[PDB]
Amino acid sequence: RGKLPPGPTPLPLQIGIKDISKSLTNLSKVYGPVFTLYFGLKPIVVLHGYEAVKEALIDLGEEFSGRGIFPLAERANRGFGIVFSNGKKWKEIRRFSLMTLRNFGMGKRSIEDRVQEEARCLVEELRKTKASPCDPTFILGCAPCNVICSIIFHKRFDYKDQQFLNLMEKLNENIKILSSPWIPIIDYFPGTHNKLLKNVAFMKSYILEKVKEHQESMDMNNPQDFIDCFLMKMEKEKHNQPSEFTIESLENTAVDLFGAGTETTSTTLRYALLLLLKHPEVTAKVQEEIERVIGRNRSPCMQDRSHMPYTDAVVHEVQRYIDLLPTSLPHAVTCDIKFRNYLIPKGTTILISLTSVLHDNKEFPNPEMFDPHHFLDEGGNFKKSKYFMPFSAGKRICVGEALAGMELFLFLTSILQNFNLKSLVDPKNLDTTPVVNGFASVPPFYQLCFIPIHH
């Protein structure tokens, strides 16, 4: 009936995602690019190497577009948003969300507009540290969060506003819980499964409040944010019950956007500054390029990227090098499907090795080294690659891809346009080793001084 790929016999201190990825790569050398692992009677089919990831996620896109159940089901019922939903519900909600994020049905103000404003605020906030040692963790967190608040409720907060601090506190808690290391089984239980449930309840409740206020002034000719756009969809979906668009669904999708769009961006920003401190020659050329293409008066805009190949290679290289989500989020096949000499049954969990693609040693010689030239051709031009999959690939590719690319490019250039980065430790001694984490490559702690730029 099914015939899964071969693998090690069943069941294969604190172990992180990077350790797991390393294990998966070692296993691919034994069993090949496609293999099965079992954790109990639970089989997980692993895809390793670009060719197998492409053939599955891209060439059989639909069949591999399902979401893998995960280490639990969340009776909070997370399955009504985008991240953990499946089927028809996922299909319509993901589509709606993609298009709204691409400026459709959200008013005339652009997404870039919002990101440029936050960029300006991020710079002002960084000026407030008065060039004294700073751990940028918090400030780099507020920026991405505020862009999602602006897109979802049409509101951005001061980084000192309690409401805003509360949302981030809850998000950080859930993220730290969901990404705890393993030791067989996850590692969290103490008093946690309930904090996850409660914090989510709190967040949904906070959003529902905003939803209630939007319903008061809802106007079919004036949506200006994600909530208006969603409420206008429900409107058009009435007389066609049961719709996938409901208040429960709007709040869960809103919660997904916050969770998926805050920490990933924030961690990549923090990792980028750390790689910039570590490689002062790279930073200097980014600053040179910023200086000659944009100058220091006007704010950076997305059109500048095509004229700044070194900086574009640097942003790509940060994402490629750090391998933020080594195994993406788990997938599942949507029906029984023949894949090479195998027969995978509907619902089988599929684990993708993004590390195996981002760190392919033939596409990116010396893949373990940080090097902007992994994205530069032999003439120094920007070189795009089919192996650049930090956002994954296929039908489940990060719905926030465009938004995240804008945040990384605009925030990084804004920061480098206004400040020189000064590391306390001598770069040569600066340790860039990732801290153990269950789902993500996270950078170690560091501080730096944001010194108003000078020459």
Beta-sheet strands, E only, within 290-336: 331-332
174 binding ligand FLP? (CB under 6 A) = yes
Residue 384 CB, nearest approach to ligand FLP (Å): 23
Nearer Cβ to ligand HEM, position 330 or 427?
A: 330
**Cα–Cα distance measured from residue 327 to residue 307, given in angstroms and rounded to the nearest whole number:** 33
Question: Minimum CB separation from ligand FLP for residue 177, in Å?
Answer: 8
Closest CA to 331 of 41, 39, 60: 60
Q: Residues comprising the binding site?
A: 398
Q: Which does 328 bind (CB under 5 to 8 A by kind): ligand HEM, ligand FLP, none?
A: ligand HEM
Q: State the DSSP H helix or E strand holding residue 34, giving kind and residue range, or none if neither.
A: strand 34-38
Radius of gyration of the chain (CA): 22
Which residues lie closer than 8 Å to 335 by C-beta, 6 or more apart? 63, 346
334 touches 346 (CB < 8 A)? yes
Q: Is 333 exposed, middle or buried (0-12, 13-18, 19+ CB in 10 A)?
A: buried
Q: What, of ligand FLP, ligand HEM, none, does residue 391 touch, CB below 5 to 8 Å by kind?
A: ligand HEM
Which residue, 47, 43, 32, 60, is CA-closest to 3? 43
* Residue among 441, 179, 445, 436 at smallest CA distance from 321: 441
Binding residue ranges for heme: 398
Residues 308-347, one symbol each (x = binds ligand FLP by CB under 6 A, - = not), give: ---------------------x------------------
Interface pick for ligand FLP out of 200, 314, 357, 416 (rule CB under 6 A): 200
**Closer CB to ligand FLP, 27 or 196, in the complex:** 196
Which of ligand FLP, ligand HEM, none does 443 bind, CB closer than 5 to 8 A by kind?
A: none
Separation of alpha carbons 131 and 119, rounded Å: 18
Query: Which option in ligand HEM, ligand FLP, none does residue 392 bind, with CB closer than 5 to 8 A by kind?
Result: ligand HEM
**Is the CB of 83 or the CB of 315 nearer to ligand FLP?**
83
Please state, in angstroms and rounded to a whole number, the distance separating the CA atoms of residues 118 and 440. Answer: 25
Cross-strand bridge partners of residue 442? 435
Among 175, 269, 274, 408, binds ligand FLP (CB under 6 A): 175
Interacting residue ranges for ligand HEM, rule: CB under 6 A: 67, 82-83, 94, 101, 256-257, 260-261, 264-265, 268, 324-325, 328-329, 390-392, 396, 398-400, 403-404
Cis peptide before 242 (omega within 30 of 0): yes
Kindly state the smallest distance separating residue 331's Cβ from ligand FLP, in Å.
13
Under 8 Å between Cβ of 453 and 193: no
Residue number of the CB closest to ligand HEM reads 400
Q: Tell whether residue 106 is a contact of ligand FLP (CB under 6 A).
A: no
State the nearest-atom distance from the C-beta of 65 to ligand HEM, in Å: 8
Q: Which does 399 bind (CB under 5 to 8 A by kind): ligand FLP, ligand HEM, none?
A: ligand HEM
Specify the amino acid at residue 163. Q
- Distance separating alpha carbons of residues 61 and 94, to the nearest angstrom: 15
CA 276 to chain CA centroid, Å, is 20
* Residues within window 223-262 making contact with ligand FLP, judged by CB under 6 A: 255-256, 259-260
Relative orientation angle of helices 401-418 and 280-293, to the nearest 10 degrees: 90
Residue closer to ligand HEM, measured from CB, 268 or 418: 268
Query: Smaller CB distance to ligand FLP: residue 37 or 167?
Result: 167
Sign of CA dihedral 47, 48, 50, 51: negative
Residue 60 touches which of ligand HEM, ligand FLP, none (Cβ within 5-8 Å per kind): none
The partner in contact with residue 259, picked from ligand HEM, ligand FLP, none with C-beta cut-offs of 5 to 8 angstroms by kind, is ligand FLP
264 counts as binding ligand FLP under rule CB under 6 A = yes
Q: How far apart are CA 321 and CA 230, in angstroms?
A: 37
Nearest 5 degrees, angle CA 411-CA 413-CA 416? 110
Point out which span in 26-34, 93-101, 171-179, 204-212 binds ligand FLP (CB under 6 A).
171-179
State whether residue 449 is helix, strand or coil. Answer: strand
Site for ligand FLP in 82-101 (CB under 6 A): 83
Which residues would be at the binding site for ligand FLP (CB under 6 A)?
78, 83, 171, 174-175, 178, 196, 200, 255-256, 259-260, 264, 329
